[PDB]
Design a protein around this nucleic acid. Structure first.
Ligand SMILES: [Mg+2]
Length: 155
RNA sequence: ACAUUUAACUAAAACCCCUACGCAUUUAUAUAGAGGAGACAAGUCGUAAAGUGUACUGGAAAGUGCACUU
């Protein structure tokens, strides 16, 4: 598929890279993604002001996180909402305010994750650990998975 | 570590120590694998309000947010 150059780099970004974001983890824990080459904007007949990147996806035999897609999407989006802050500041929004501090601590403890890691520094295996612990919590709290902190901020 | 013997009616003889250097140290070569630069590719190729920086971007051919310039 052809994407915009920035989107192609983000889909094909490594850990720590300036383009590491939600798309990187989401595409890379399910597919082997390679950004093959970029086409400049002058090569398109109505010339855009952007470049274009061509990216190849191959589904992985063994996905790097064996969890439901929507659970992984929630975990990744909450991790990457504050991309330049410590990871725990993003994870704490997954839980209600009342249990925010305690549950985040339980999560990081059971996941063996350093709280000081920035989102751009988290590998797919860290996300695997966090997602497995989060699914266990959601099994042990049926109303957790449907929590949206913005709605509880509306009230 | 190691030690002054003989000899001396002219004067001479004798002399000989034991201890490594290595999975240490310096540089270089060969090898798996990965990554860059060069030739604007030449054509019997095709055709006729704006700007700058920075931050996020998962409905990104660019957008929005902040600050600036004419
Ligand atoms: Mg947008």
């Amino acid at each position: 598929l052809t994407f915009q150059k920035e989107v192609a780099e983000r889909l094909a970004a490594n850990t720590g890279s300036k383009q590491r974001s939600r798309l990187s983890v989401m595409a890379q824990y399910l597919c082997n993604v390679r950004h093959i080459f970029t086409i400049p904007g002058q090569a398109f007949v109505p010339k855009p002001e952007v470049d274009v990147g061509v990216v190849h996806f191959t589904p992985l035999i063994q996905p790097k996180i064996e969890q439901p897609f929507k659970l992984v999407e929630k975990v990744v989006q909450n991790v990457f909402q504050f991309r330049r802050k410590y990871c725990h500041r993003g994870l704490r929004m997954l839980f209600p305010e009342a249990q925010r501090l305690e549950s985040t601590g339980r999560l990081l403890e059971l996941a063996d994750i350093d709280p000081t890691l920035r989102p751009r520094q988290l590998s797919i295996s860290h996300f695997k650990s966090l997602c497995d612990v989060y699914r266990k919590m959601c099994d042990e709290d049926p109303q957790l998975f449907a929590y949206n902190f913005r709605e509880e901020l509306k009230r």
